[PDB]
Each structure stands twice: as structure tokens, then as C-alpha cells.
Design a protein around this ligand. Structure first.
Ligand SMILES: [Mg+2]
Ligand SMILES: [Mg+2]
Lengths: 333, 333
């Protein structure tokens, strides 16, 4: 079986996806973590980018139409961006970056690079990412230049697939909307330049494609005794912590559950006392849980817990009073 | 003008909503904060509730169909819940809580109370919330009992409106799906009870209605010199912090912007040096920013900043090194 078939079998088995395709309990968490990271690094982390959410009663058009409004209430001037999570019925994280046409090309390259680095910063092997520029044959009527980030999914024939497209649509969008709506959307310069209709650089990433890329790239099988493991970035892992009492003994449970409640205040935690500890470690590793917290009888007097890191499996026993902080620093976000 | 007209004018003016209706830059942040709080207190904060996301190609049905799968991969037994953000084209935060029929009524009351408290815990005046039980005339064919939480929006005639419905749909849903799909979804008991098809308690809250209720309830006008203010809970405010240098002097900006960058790592921050400080304080108050951080020339040597709290307007000057923590403790989430 191919890598894709293996990962899909795992995803169905552990509830990442359910055959229908619908996202199961882990799939929703991974999807929302991906969306949160995209919004964080695109909207809230950038002063020149603000968000918007439009209705698609039956998508990027909803941004252009509201351009004027955004310029007024948000008090933004080019270069600046408007981001959105558009239900293209698959979701798509898209952004329209309005810039002076003179800089259009420079900005384009910027967003071609930044976006790529984004994926790399979340744990994707750069060797599994590449750039594919559309020739004039592909270039849409409005797009002067189009560059697709492509990920090595592992298909038959061509193993690469589009993951995100960054296009230079020029001034076609705003000009069309101005002509059709009878409203001037021009930012004619009165400061060291001439009149222009803002050019648009459009990064658009299919959320499903992003999740598939992260899931496939995180897969690993390392020894002997083989171990299937999703090496997710901590910010993307569906489950951040696993509170695993050493046994079902009624002494460990009342304290391990209190610790799990403390942790659930902040992160999504999974509590499991079923069976042997090694099986539970393998369970958590299969779904990329970055840390496991084990409570044993020695904790009833020593008042500590064993923290096991996913990839290395190295264990460190630390005071139960500090666990939260010890995890926060390591979980980020 | 009515309270609703006033709040709507403010929302359009400040970009909460744009006339089309679409959410502007602040509206998206408020909406996502509401959704995050709902998911946090319903899914990640409860071990007996897990999430799911289904496709609605043209909503609660998608949950029932996947019930079996969830019971297998999630390893859950009744009483337990499955939550979802269903695109009913308006979004709706819904949950299906499967329970043994014997407890169905008790659990029902629980979710009638808990949900209500949820709103109250996020800053809604309990006096503006009420319960409305549907008579048998209203009770749907499948619903034995139906209770709507209603909020005092301020309409004409009847000023109340549905905000969230909590229904006891009995075993109609799973029984229908079993008959139609040829799959047994029964949890026939083999432990101190008899055979049953899990009963369903359904809390469903319209996200738009929730956002409208929060926006309306947060509105206030307090003196003299009147001050319009959205008294949002810190977890719901679209903007958590406002870095406001005392003036555009080139000495304050390079440091205030560094502080704003530090804060943007964590929260959504708004930087504004335009005009007088009082006007900027009023701007931030109009949209419910819980804290304003002012940098003045005294900071260039004292290395401190003035933190102004929204409601009280009380100011406290604290070291710029501690600001993040000082805000974290006060912003929650
Ligand atoms: Mg921004
Ligand atoms: Mg849960």
C-alpha cells in the first residue's frame, strides 16, 4: 500500500476522518488548529492585514465588494491585506493584498516566500514542498503571474498536488467591481506617485489540502519494535496532553483526574486508564500527542508526575505543581 | 431610535458588520471568540463531549449518522455528547447528548441550566435572559419537551427572541437512522438496566443570535460627558489591547511598536497614534477594548507604561517588562 493509503487507514481508524468524507473528533481539532495558525500568522500578527467574513448564499468577490468599507472603518491604506475563510463545499483560507501596482511584483515574491515558510515553520519538510509557476497557457485572463505551492502527496503518476496558489491578479478585480457597481474603488495617489487602482496579490490555500499535507508529512515509522507516530507540530496536534495514570487503582484516579481537569482549562486533554501503559503510549504516539503525563503511586507521596516526550520518548519526572507551565512553554500557542 | 438601531448604527460604523449583512474586521473577531468559548466550555472542557464536522452539500443528521463511528474511535459510552458547528447559510453551534432514557429528563434540565449559565458567565445580564417552554402545540412530533432560552433584544411588539433551543428529541433520531440505514445504533444495556436506544438532548444556539445578544447586552452609555462603551467580557472583545503612544514623536513610536509586536504574538492588538489620546481612548471604549497601554516620554527613562482599564478608566503605571503577564492574568483565555 502507498503512503497515502496507510495514512488514510490510520485517519479512519483513529477518527481523523469518517467514510461518508467527514472529520471525526481528531480531524476537527487538527483543522481548527490549522485555521488558527493561519489566522494568527496572517491577520492578528500583521498590522497591515485585517479579517472579514462574507456570506456565500447559493467567494473572494465578497472581499472586493467590501474593500471600500474596510478602508473606512479599519482605516487602512495600501499596502494592506484583507483575509477571509471562504466556503469555496470546501473551506479555503484566502487573502487579498492590495498594493500600489509599482510594487506589485516585489510584494508577489514576498507572499510566495512568506507563505512557503509558514508551512515549513509548522513542521513540513521543505523537500516535500515546491513552487510551480503557471505558464501563459495556464495564466488566467486576469492573472499576470500565478505560482502554486505544491506538496508531494504521493499520488499515482504525478505525486505532487496543489496546496496553495499565489496569484497576481493585477487591477482586474477592483476595476471590474467599480465598473459594475458604479463606485470608485481607486486609491489615486496624491503623495510622491500617480493615480492607480490597487493591484491584488491573492494567496489562497485549500484547508482540506493543508490538513492532508500536514497529516501525510507528520507520518513516521521508527524502530526491532516499530512505532507509528505522527510528528505534528505542537500547535497542530489534536491532543496536546495525555493524563495516563499507571493503573486503575482508586488512589491514582482521583488525583490524575484533578490534574486532567487543570490541564483541560487550557488545552485539549485525553484521559486514559485502559490497560497497560505502553499500549496507551503507542495510542498517543499514533495521533501525535506531544506529551504524556503519567501518575503513579510514587506521586501520592513524592507529588510528582512523569512527562514523556513523543518523538524522543525521553521521560522527565517533575513536580505536579509546575506541570502546566512546563507544558505551556513546550506547547506554544 | 431604539437600542437595536443604536447598536446597529455603531456596528456598521466601526466595522462589526457591513451592509450587504457581512461581518467586518471586528465582527469576525467577536464571532470567532464566541465560537471558541462555546467549543472550549462544551467540547475541550468536558471529557464526555467530543467534536465532529460534517459536510452539508446542498445538519444535526450528520451527527446521528456518525454516532456509531464516534462510539468506536472516541471510545465513548452514554451519557456522552457530540458537538458540531453546523452551517444551518447561518452557522449554528449544536450538540447532541446521548443518554439512557431513564435519565433523559434530569440531563435535560442540566443542559437547560448549564447553557444558561454559560451566557451569564460571559457577561450577559441574567435579567435579559429567560426560559420559554414550548407547549404541546409547539412541541415537534419528535420532541417530548422543548425549552428555548430567549434574550431581550428589544424588538417591536414582543421584545424577546430565541437565542438557543434545548430539546428532548427522545429516541426518534437514532431509531429513524437505524431503520433507514439498516444499522443497529442501540446501546442495549448489559449492566444494571435494560435495552434502549439512546435518548438525545439537543442544545442548538444560532451563532448570529448569540453575537447579536452579546453586542446588544454589552452596550452602555455612562457619564456631564457621555461615553459610549461596549462592556464585553475580555474573552469576547474583538481587540484585547490598544498600544497608544502619547504622540507621533519619533521617540515613542519605535518602542511602542516593539511592545505592540510583543503583544501581537498572543492577542489581537490595535496600534493608533492618530490625534489626541482622549479621542483614542473613546475609540477603544466604543468597541470594548478591555485595556489601553500608553507609552509616553517618561517611559523612555522610567521604562514603564500606563495601563488604562476600560470600564473604570483607572490607570496604573507598570513596568514594560511585565505588561504581557499583567495583561494575561486579566484577559483570561
Ligand atoms: Mg491584523
Ligand atoms: Mg471533550
Amino acid at each position: 500500500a502507498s503512503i497515502i493509503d496507510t495514512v488514510a487507514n490510520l485517519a479512519k481508524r483513529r477518527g481523523f476522518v469518517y467514510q461518508s468524507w467527514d472529520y471525526g473528533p481528531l480531524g476537527v481539532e487538527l483543522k481548527e488548529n490549522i485555521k488558527r495558525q493561519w489566522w494568527k500568522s496572517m491577520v492578528t500578527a500583521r498590522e497591515d492585514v485585517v479579517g472579514i467574513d462574507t456570506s456565500i448564499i447559493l467567494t473572494a468577490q465578497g472581499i472586493f465588494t467590501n474593500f471600500a468599507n474596510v478602508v473606512t472603518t479599519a482605516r487602512k491604506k495600501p499596502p494592506f491585506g484583507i483575509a477571509q475563510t471562504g466556503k469555496s463545499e470546501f473551506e479555503q483560507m484566502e487573502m487579498e493584498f492590495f498594493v500600489e501596482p509599482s510594487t506589485a511584483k516585489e510584494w508577489h515574491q514576498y507572499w510566495i516566500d512568506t507563505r512557503l515558510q509558514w508551512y515549513v515553520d509548522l513542521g513540513i519538510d521543505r523537500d516535500n514542498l515546491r513552487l510551480y509557476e503557471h505558464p501563459p497557457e495556464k495564466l488566467s485572463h486576469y492573472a499576470e503571474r500565478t505560482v502554486d505551492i505544491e506538496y508531494k502527496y504521493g499520488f499515482a503518476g504525478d505525486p505532487w498536488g496543489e496546496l496553495e496558489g499565489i496569484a497576481n491578479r493585477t487591477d482586474f478585480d477592483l476595476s471590474t467591481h467599480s465598473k459594475h457597481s458604479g463606485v470608485d474603488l481607486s486609491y489615486y495617489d496624491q503623495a510622491t506617485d500617480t493615480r492607480y487602482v490597487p493591484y491584488v496579490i491573492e494567496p489562497a490555500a485549500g484547508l482540506t489540502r493543508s490538513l492532508m499535507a500536514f497529516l501525510i508529512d507528520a507520518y513516521s515509522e521508527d524502530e526491532v519494535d516499530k512505532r507509528t507516530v505522527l510528528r505534528f507540530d505542537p500547535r497542530l496536534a489534536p491532543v496536546k496532553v495525555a493524563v495516563l495514570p499507571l493503573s486503575r487503582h482508586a488512589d491514582l484516579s482521583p488525583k490524575a483526574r484533578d490534574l486532567a481537569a487543570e490541564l483541560r482549562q487550557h488545552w485539549n486533554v485525553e484521559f486514559d486508564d485502559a490497560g497497560a501503559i505502553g499500549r496507551r503510549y503507542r495510542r498517543q504516539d499514533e495521533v501525535g500527542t506531544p506529551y504524556c503525563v503519567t501518575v503513579d503511586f510514587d506521586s501520592l507521596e513524592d507529588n510528582a508526575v512523569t512527562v514523556r516526550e513523543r518523538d524522543s520518548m525521553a521521560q522527565e519526572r517533575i513536580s505536579i505543581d509546575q506541570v502546566t507551565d512546563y507544558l505551556a512553554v513546550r506547547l506554544k500557542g
